Amino acid sequence: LQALHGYYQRMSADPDAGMPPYGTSMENISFALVLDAKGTLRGIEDLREQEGKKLRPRKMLVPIAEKKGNGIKPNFLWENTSYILGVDAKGKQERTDKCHAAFIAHIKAADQDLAAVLQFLEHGSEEVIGSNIVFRIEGEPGFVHERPAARQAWANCLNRREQGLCGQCLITGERQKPIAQLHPSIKGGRDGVRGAQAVASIVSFNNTAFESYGKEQSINAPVSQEAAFSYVTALNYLLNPSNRQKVTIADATVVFWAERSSPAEDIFAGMFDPPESVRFHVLGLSPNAARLSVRFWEVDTVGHMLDKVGRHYRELEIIPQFNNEQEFPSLSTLLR
Amino acid sequence: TYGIRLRVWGDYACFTRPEMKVERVSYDVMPPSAARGILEAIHWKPAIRWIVDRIHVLRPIVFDNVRRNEVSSKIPKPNPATAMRDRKPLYFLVDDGSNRQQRAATLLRNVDYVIEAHFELTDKAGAEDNAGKHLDIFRRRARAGQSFQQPCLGCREFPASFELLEGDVPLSCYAGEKRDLGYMLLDIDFERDMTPLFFKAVMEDDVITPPSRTSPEVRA
Amino acid sequence: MTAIANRYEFVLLFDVENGNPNGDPDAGNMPRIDPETGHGLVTDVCLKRKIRNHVALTKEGAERFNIYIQEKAILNETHERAYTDAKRVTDWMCTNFYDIRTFGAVMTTEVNCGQVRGPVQMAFARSVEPVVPQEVSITRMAVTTKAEAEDNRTMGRKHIVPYGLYVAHGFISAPLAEKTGFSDEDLTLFWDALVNMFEHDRSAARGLMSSRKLIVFKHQNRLGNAPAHKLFDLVKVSRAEGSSGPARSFADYAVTVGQAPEGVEVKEML
Amino acid sequence: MTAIANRYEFVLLFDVENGNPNGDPDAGNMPRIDPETGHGLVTDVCLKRKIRNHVALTKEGAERFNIYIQEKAILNETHERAYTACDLKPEPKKLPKKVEDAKRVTDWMCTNFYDIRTFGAVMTTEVNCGQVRGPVQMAFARSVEPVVPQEVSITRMAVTTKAEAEDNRTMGRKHIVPYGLYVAHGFISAPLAEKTGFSDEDLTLFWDALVNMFEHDRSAARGLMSSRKLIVFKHQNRLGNAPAHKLFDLVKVSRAEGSSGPARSFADYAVTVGQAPEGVEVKEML
């Protein structure tokens, strides 16, 4: 929906809104490695946080990640132990060795920091196993991936990849835009769409029965790459529980947005305990096994659901016995 | 003068959006390509072309949901020679494992439209061919209720009832409103190896006027 | 190759009793209902599946009556092939597969756009008046997994419809048959299949179902002779005079047919 | 196990008197009824249980006459036996590849479980063994006339668990049907039988079970129930010669002309059987 694209375009213009800049996304990180400028590792920083229930990682803004199928794709500068330490618990060592080789190779595409980390890669507690890690120079603020030269290299890589075919973008209607062969994933589970696969998508053409006119893969529906990135990031942001714009009803998760959300947020009680910018887009979607489907879609104002609730309550009207009774009983009281 | 007015209505319809194809979701109104498709179902020959001009919407918009079981893949080409020379069964096993796929859908529930179009001569047409003759044949067929095949509202399981008009367009629900729809599909270019085209759609006074799909500047 | 010479249309009526005619994958297994009217709904693919199964059971692999799409009712026996430029392969397989010859198919590899459409078509079926399903609770004496052993018992649920009558429409296109070889014997077999679909369909959920009537319109022209939607209006069904309250048997309705225009003939197989 | 070679259909009648034929797990324990008209109902699942019990009682675990749905058993263990007998390893939620066809285990089970051979079962659990459809089916039973259940209140002079609030009394209530008459339908198919070997001796045992079903089912709640009539239609060829609904119409039940007011015994009704078409034979003495 172009509405998500517009929402991202608008809100990203606000520096403090929390929109990840182009080409970056927020991920889970557990530890950071500290090595001197000479290329020798010493010092480990653990950023995991105790959430009361459990010790869980922390959210960090990093370059976006590839959608890893069965193939090997190396991430730019942050990875898990298998790619970095060449070690794992999967037993198949050669796979880890190939991952490590690809990871080191991708780097080469002059900075002293990357020179040092390259030097450490000449050799490359247990909890680090399987977690995501980042690199920091001894006594250096920030992180290596945050240095401007790294950003220039990342932009250069992006320019390298975005080449070749061009066509008309359906969301914008413009001509001669590079078309995306694959779309970035969407978070599922506890902090995303509830009950869906770890990574899900809206558009996918994995089976032959779904193809037409001899097209294939995502090219079956053309959209410019940056446009694909935009709405995916916006959807991921809205799904974040920290922002109070998400609620679960029945099986479908509901998301809404406007320039203000406190009143609509009260729909929480609308089911838990029954009683210039666009205003109250409402989207409700339900999960398939590994792909998502749209349940309903409204753009009305007020947020009224009286159509059913109003009827439901007016059917229950009766004069009370005492004068101190309450007009609107909760379902819990009625059931009890 | 020239061109025809035709009326069509039914109970179900589904014009799937290209980008939500696996989980079907329908446009708000019939795109020109479907109108192209329906007209050719009554009369068409290689020597002529259909040109769509306008569409009228006469009912409000409504939605509903349906879910069904479906198949995952198509069938392969056989070799007749070897097949018979050694008896071997051929088939596709629907119930087996991943072959079964379940797909949801959302679709319109009550429709009615009026279509305005006119003919045009194909290059390969013979010299004897005249557009007026085919137009008269079309009018005869429409009045008689005759057709090459039953029309459909996007999918074969949605038959459409139709009629020919000889009067003025009646008023409609959104005759006094203007509403935006965004970009939508215009038509497919078969010459450019089946490449699609798009245009910006705005509904006002319940009438739509897409640009000409044959125009070269549209092809750009 | 020979083909039927006239356009056709037909109407079918059938009913269910204390059964679930077609379950809904989306809402547990409630029978489908149309929210706008409370009328029941049945999809066509179910009927196509039933027709396929009946033909498979009856013919038992005659030369030109094999069925391609199977659902694990397959059996092992000697097959036959009659012999018949990709068009060569297309005709060869169309000449000895009934369901392909009747409904058409889509094929993995092709050149540009070319469709095997098939001359038969049909739409959804809906009840004549509102229906109300019921819920049933059941129990079992045993449990399956060892983990849940903590003595052993469980529950379940069922959904049924007390009674209902349904109607269907369909069409046949002669010109399309002229491109596939659909001929008369096939049409007679088709009538028989429609008549005798449900006799082999008994199961634990469907209860008792049966067909009741079948009206056929035969046009004079190769194309039509009158609008279809007007023909469907001739058939009329209404509740008998003595019937009162909810309907519970076929005896509670009366069905009548008018007189069709000159160019079409009306027949009654049931 | 040679299969039968004809299509069969039958009808059954049975009574109830001052008892609860089949209680409802939800509405307390009220007898099942149709809310719109007040007619009674009995789930087919209830009857199959009685038939299983009768077979188990009469055959007493004879070989090839075991029952699969046994009291408080664990099904997955039973499935694993088939793999042990045919001597191949199982897999989680999968069947063996056809090198040792799963038909081996399928036959091994169909061969020595009567209820599976007769009704079929669903066995695609964590230890997978396939599915069966069953050549015998039957529908819900319904009463000819509306029934009027009534409720009874009773007392007990003892208490169970440290009711210290009292050593004192306690009360409960129960529900019954004064009288009622029910009808049932069923079918048998030859093509399905040929896949499982349902033979003739099985059919005779089935008739006997139907006739003698209720005599072993006495309990404090059922009151008195008995069977009254049984009519069997047999077709002359592998596939029938008439629609089922036509056959069932040949049996009609109506109140005796002299009876008036509510019915209270089988003598208040009259039963009649029509004349069957040429292609079917009606045998009744059962």
**SS3 of A78-98:** CEEHHHHCCCCCCCCHHHHHH
Dist. CA A290–CA B71, nearest whole Å: 17
Strand A292-298 vs strand A246-249: parallel, antiparallel, or unpaired?
unpaired
From residue D139, alpha-carbon distances to B216, D242, D253 in Å are 67, 20, 19
Instruction: Give the Å distances, CA to CA, from D63 to A4, C221, D59, D114.
Output: 69, 68, 9, 10
CA dihedral A184→A190→A196→A197, nearest 10 degrees, is 60
Q: Is C192 on the interface with B (CB under 8 A)?
A: no
Give me the amino acid identity at A227: A
Report helix angle D44-59 to D200-212, nearest 10.
Answer: 110
SS3 C159: strand
Touching check for A176 and chain B: CB below 8 Å?
no
Whole-angstrom Cα distance, residue D251 to residue D249? Answer: 5
**In the structure, do chain A and chain B come into contact, i.e. share 3 or more CB pairs under 8 Å?**
yes
Name every chain C residue with its beta carbon within 8 A of the beta carbon of B164: none
Residue-wise DSSP of D200-242: HHHHHHHHHHHHHGGGG---TTT-EEEEEEEEEEEESSSS-SS
CB-count burial class (<10 Å; 0-12, 13-18, 19+) for D95? middle
CA–CA distance, B89 with A271 (Å, rounded to integer): 57
A116 phi/psi in degrees, rounded to 5:
-65, -50
Cβ atoms within 10 Å of B219's Cβ, excluding its own:
12
- The structure was resolved to a resolution in Å of 2.9
Tokens of residue A303, six digits: 């947020």
In this structure, what token pair is assigned to residue C97?
Answer: 């597969």
DSSP-based three-state secondary structure for A333: helix
Task: Please give the structure tokens belonging to residue A107.
Answer: 């780097």
Q: Do D74 and C208 touch (CB under 8 A)?
A: no
Closest C-alpha to C216, from C240, C180, C246, C191: C191
Q: Hey, is A160 helix, strand or coil?
A: helix
What letter does residue D119 receive in the DSSP assignment? H
Amino acid at residue number B67: R
Q: Please give the torsion angle defined by the CA atoms of residues A65, A69, A71 and A73, in that order, rounded to the nearest 10 degrees.
A: 0
User: Shortest Cα distance from C248 to chain D (angstroms)?
Assistant: 10
Question: Residue D63: CB partners within 8 Å, gap ≥ 6?
Answer: D112
Residue type, B139: R
Quote the CA–CA distance of A7 and B182 in Å, as a whole number. Answer: 16
Tell me which residue has tokens 């529930």: B109
Beta-carbon contacts of B3 under 8 Å, excluding residues fewer than 6 positions away, are B53, B116, B117, B118
Sign of torsion over alpha carbons C179, C185, C186, C191: positive
**Does C89 contact B102 at a Cβ distance shorter than 8 Å?**
no
Q: Which one of D8, D32, D33, D36 makes the best mutation probe of the C interface by having the most chain C beta carbons within 10 Å?
A: D36
Identity of residue B86? D
Q: Is the dihedral of CA C94, C98, C101, C104 positive or negative?
A: negative
Chain B touched by A24 (CB under 8 Å) = no
**Residue type for D146, please?**
P
Query: Strands A246-249 and A252-257: what pairing?
Result: antiparallel
The residue whose two tokens read 């980390």 is: A117
**3-state percent breakdown (helix, strand, coil) of chain B, nearest 5:** 20, 40, 45
Residue D166, amino acid: E
Q: Kindly tell me the burial class for residue D159, based on how many C-beta atoms sit within 10 Å of its own C-beta (0-12, 13-18, 19 or more).
A: middle
Are A and D touching by the rule of 3+ CB pairs within 8 Å?
no
Q: Diameter of chain A by CA atoms?
A: 85
CB atoms within 10 A of CB C194: 22
Give the separation between CA A168 and CA A178, rounded to whole angstroms.
Answer: 8
Half-sphere exposure of D68 (CA within 13 A, CB side): 24
Structure tokens at B17: 């959006």
Which of C172, A295, C131, C124 is closest to B12 using CA atoms? C124
Find the chain B residues whose C-beta atoms sit closer than 8 A to any C-beta of C: 12, 64-65, 67-69, 73-80, 83-84, 87-96, 102, 104, 109, 141, 144-150, 156-159, 161, 163, 190, 194
CA-closest candidate to residue D105, choices D73, D74, D128, D126: D128
d(CA C84, CA C90) in angstroms, rounded, equals 9
What dihedral angle (degrees, nearest 10) is formed by the CA atoms of A244, A248, A253, A258?
-30
- Nearest Cα neighbor of D207 from D188, D189, D235 is D188
Residue of A26, A31, A62 whose CA lies nearest to A48: A31
Sequence-ordered list of residues with C-beta below 8 angstroms from that of D212, at least 6 positions apart, any chain: D54
Task: Using the structure block, give the residue that is written with the tokens 């059941």.
Answer: C138
CB C88 within 8 A of CB B80: yes
Taking CB atoms and an 8 Å limit, are B80 and C83 in contact across chains? yes
Question: In the PDB record, what is the listed experimental method?
Answer: cryo-EM
Q: Which helix (H) or strand (E) holds D79?
A: helix D75-86
CA–chain centroid gap for A69, Å, is 18
Q: What is the dihedral of CA C231, C237, C238, C241, to 10 degrees?
A: 120
CB crowding C102-119: b at 16 or more within 10 Å, else e: bbbbebeeeeeeeebebb
Residues 6+ apart with CB under 8 A from A40: A120
- D73: distance to nearest CA of chain C, Å? 5
Q: To 10 degrees, what angle do helices A148-161 and A112-120 make? A: 80
Q: What is the C-alpha separation between C173 and C104, in angstroms, rounded?
A: 13
How far does Cα D159 stand from its chain's mean position? Answer: 38
Amino acid at C117: R
Amino acid at D187: F
Count of CB atoms within 10 A of residue D270's CB?
A: 12
Q: Which residues pair with B195 in a beta bridge?
A: B189
Minimum-distance CB partner of C141 among D44, D71, D76? D71
State whether residue C167 sits within 8 Å of chain B by CB: no
Show the tokens assigned to D122.
Answer: 């669903």
**D29/A186 Cα distance (integer angstroms):** 50
Name residue B64's beta-bridge partners. Answer: B107
Task: Characterize the bridge pairing of strands C154-172 and C134-140.
Answer: antiparallel
H helices present in chain B, as ranges: 32-40, 80-85, 131-144, 216-219
- Side chain identity at B28, as an amino acid letter? D
Give me the torsion for CA of B185, B191, B194, B198, rounded to 10°.
-20
Structure tokens at C262: 């000159």
Question: Angle at which helices C184-195 and C44-59 pack, to 10 degrees?
Answer: 110
Question: Distance between CA D57 and CA D55 in Å, rounded?
Answer: 5
Integer distance in angstroms from the first to the last C-alpha of chain D?
A: 25
| Cβ separation C144–D75 shorter than 8 A | yes
The 3-state secondary structure of B66-93 reads: EEEEEECCCECCCCHHHHHHCCCCCCEE
Query: If you ran DSSP here, which 8-state letter would residue A274 be given?
Result: -
Which residues are bridge partners to D176 per DSSP?
A: D150
Contact A145/A134 with Cβ under 8 angstroms?
Answer: yes
Compute the CA torsion angle C225, C227, C230, C232 (nearest 10 deg). 80
